[PDB]
Nucleic acid binder design. Structure first.
Ligand SMILES: Nc1ncnc2c1ncn2[C@@H]1O[C@H](COP(=O)(O)OP(=O)(O)OP(=O)(O)O)[C@@H](O)[C@H]1O
Ligand SMILES: Nc1ncnc2c1ncn2[C@@H]1O[C@H](COP(=O)(O)OP(=O)(O)OP(=O)(O)O)[C@@H](O)[C@H]1O
Ligand SMILES: Nc1ncnc2c1ncn2[C@@H]1O[C@H](COP(=O)(O)OP(=O)(O)OP(=O)(O)O)[C@@H](O)[C@H]1O
Ligand SMILES: [Mg+2]
Ligand SMILES: [Mg+2]
Ligand SMILES: [Mg+2]
Lengths: 316, 316, 316
DNA sequence: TTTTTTTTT
């Protein structure tokens, strides 16, 4: 896709282009998607300058009213991914759709971080297997990222381990304000190359700790909302898919619907429920089998599925 | 590792450096990991001052996107430890991995407060035996720390008792708010020397008593979450391993899965289940043998094991 | 040990010192051990006042990180006691260790509110006999405290009866909530003089009756947990030993391990099993001999023993 | 929006 350099040739000075780029902008879409009020806060751009920039941008590409079918065709390159279990993949329509947010949540030991580790490997595959030749960015908020597991699960897919380990990009988000800047940065390298998947293990880990003490909640929710908005922007303009791992809490409210199974009701209020495109609930079954359930999706209706976490990642 | 003194030479006044240090900060990583909102609450630092501090810090070390392999190499110094029973150690991959949280729980007289006593001794050993030349900090929340047992188990490992007893550091946490400040303090001496293991016997003993009376639960869980977050931060930035002993409760709910064996379902809700890296269940077997089970780990799958608590600590 | 009067001279008003003392506080350790949240509930102390109090306290004594050996030395005055039967005493390491909780349980006539009666007498002895020159507090929850037996067993130890009977302190706990206040009160007179042993005959007698009807269990367990916590605090800060007599129940569950000997499985759930330092099971043997077994101790491993309840208390 | 607790006979 085209960078912010193409518009360097529409009567635009190469002076603040470096300044824009410094402000986080790295392509044109991110320009069109950015608000003037926000563009005029990069400390060194002029309002009239900003208007000239916006006009140059609108020059290259336009955003009007595609009838519907050009939409159906642009969406043809939606580029789904395989999760690692034909049952689940079929329960999603192919798996983790791209340019969208999928959130999976459940109680501990529930095949969570495991599914992310497998995804990291089921992505450097030919498209006719579920994913294709895409790098992967991995932001971890709790540790528990093990390259070994990556190599292991890879061998189970006959892929050279080193090769895979050479197409992941690991970042350890220390605190929420650091996690947020991580995505800003991301917006650059996502702008050049083939990145297919972003992984946020426990998106709301840090937030839960930074803004404690209700009376401080609205601020936490607003920060989280800005974060999710940015994430979705990225996932849409770079044809990449976002995979979020969430947690759960116990409702001491009451036992009525259906009075049991407290390992539900994830954290993050409605702010995160709305912003999330697909919602999946992972529950502990029997023996070493787990039950996956699909709660929120725009494509499918609903279903149940059963999977096993073996030595080759999620399987059947 | 580098202290907070290195950044004393990047256009930083030596005035509040003492003030930072007083606030708990003792190295640079703890600086990078700290939030501005939190840094601006040390009662005597300026917001612009805080920004200059953060910039100086980011000067020394950076946190970007290691591809994956530099990660696999930095993790090479993960420095596992031996538990005292080849069967268990092999069931963990070597034992108590460093820079991570391992929680062991079970009903009484399972000697979980004995595995800690043995760990205290299996740490001042050459690395080719399971542990290496590391001091040990021991925070007890129930008493029951016996130096004698330490000397005894040591002699069983031919180590001079006095020598071992001279590399432990004992602290008696009276109440939860005191327990929390203990770790703050810890962050200092952990900053200089060779500390390999932190032990919290009955992490949730005090919490269970301080915040009683549901309707007061959320506050307890939030305090506990802050605590665990801090603990994991420490365990990660100082290459030290955290070992927590938990308790259990009886579920008067029902008898369905599998209607018996009530000595399970530890205390601490999901807040502690999630934050815990490895979970081990200790159960009473037959005669004087106990059964260890591994419920949650990111590295291994699952397994059973059998051990005996003799006169040389946990054994076979 | 030092009282709460020492801190009356660190810029502290003598106004609420009386108020603190009224709230149960009688020494400094109890101050350091008390939570602010709890201190600010004495109806007439100020939060800033509480902070000044805590600072004054921390002035006198500090609680940091003793390495280990100062611990081994402070523990040198652990001051064990003799039970009355060389076999048992040797099976404990000397007998009832001080600053700790020892619980003995078994079926009726089994020998346990008798061992308490003997302890009452084996305490006013020179230290080189098992105990030393310590008074004794006796809280009975079922009656069955007989001064006669005390005099009798004493004569068998050639001690003047009146002398012994003059160093016991008897309290009849009518109900659970009264039993709890008993210990609060205790905290005062324990603060001045030589008290070596506290005895709670049938700790859980009253609780069993007050909170009946499961659906009311959690509350009972929480009250009991607060109680045990307080007891252990006392036993630790006053170098006194706590001796609890428990009961037993029949498991209509099944007959598998080992299908007989129902006179086991005491009452009090895991809350009491955990909090208990040493656990002893008294069983009926043959003729007039009883079998003692040691189930939970931090010092010794395990063992069996045999004793006889004669006219001089527990003997061989 | 947030957060689980507890055996009996
Ligand atoms: N030297 C020893 N001294 C005391 N007990 C020993 C010794 N060696 C082995 N044991 C036995 O090993 C077991 C250890 O129990 P442990 O210390 O694990 O209790 P815990 O689980 O830590 O505490 P609790 O069960 O009260 O929460 C006990 O049965 C104990 O009697
Ligand atoms: N190679 C392996 N190493 C470790 N565990 C494995 C392996 N293969 C399968 N497992 C098992 O699969 C399960 C994976 O748990 P998972 O990694 O999903 O925890 P999580 O849900 O990501 O983290 P948490 O539950 O603590 O929030 C564990 O029970 C684990 O023991
Ligand atoms: N001087 C004495 N007076 C009464 N009984 C004595 C005496 N000396 C020995 N015994 C016997 O020793 C045993 C003591 O029983 P004990 O006092 O331990 O009952 P307990 O277990 O305390 O109470 P319960 O069993 O009702 O809960 C009884 O069988 C008792 O008859
Ligand atoms: Mg996880
Ligand atoms: Mg213990
Ligand atoms: Mg009795």
């Amino acid at each position: 896709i085209l960078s912010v350099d193409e518009l360097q040739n529409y009567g635009i000075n190469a002076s603040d282009l470096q300044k824009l780029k410094s402000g986080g902008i790295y392509t044109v879409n991110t320009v069109l998607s950015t608000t003037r009020r926000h563009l005029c806060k990069i400390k060194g751009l002029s309002e009239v300058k900003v208007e000239k920039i916006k006009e140059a941008a609108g020059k290259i590409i336009q955003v009007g009213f595609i009838p519907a079918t050009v939409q159906l065709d642009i969406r043809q390159r939606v580029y789904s991914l395989s999760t690692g279990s034909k049952q689940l993949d079929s329960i999603l329509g192919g798996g983790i759709m791209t340019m969208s947010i999928t959130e999976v949540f459940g109680e501990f030991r529930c095949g969570k971080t495991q599914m992310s580790h497998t995804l990291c490997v089921t992505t450097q595959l030919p498209r006719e297997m579920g994913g294709g030749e895409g790098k992967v960015a991995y932001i971890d908020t709790e540790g528990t990222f093990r390259p070994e597991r990556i190599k292991q699960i890879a061998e189970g897919y006959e892929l050279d381990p080193e090769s895979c380990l050479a197409n992941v990009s690991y970042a350890r988000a220390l605190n929420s304000e650091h996690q947020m800047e991580l995505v800003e940065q991301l917006g650059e390298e996502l702008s050049s190359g083939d990145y297919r998947l972003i992984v946020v293990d426990s998106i709301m880990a840090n937030f839960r700790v930074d803004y404690c003490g209700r009376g401080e909640l609205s601020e936490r929710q607003q920060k989280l909302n800005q974060h999710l908005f940015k994430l979705n922007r990225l996932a849409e303009e770079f044809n990449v898919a976002v995979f979020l791992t969430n947690q759960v809490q116990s409702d001491p409210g009451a036992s009525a619907l259906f009075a049991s199974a407290d390992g539900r009701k994830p954290i993050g209020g409605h702010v995160l429920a709305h912003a999330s495109a697909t919602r999946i609930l992972l529950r502990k079954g029997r023996g070493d089998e787990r039950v996956a359930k699909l709660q929120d999706s725009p494509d499918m209706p609903e279903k149940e599925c059963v999977y096993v976490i073996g030595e080759k990642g999620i399987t059947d």
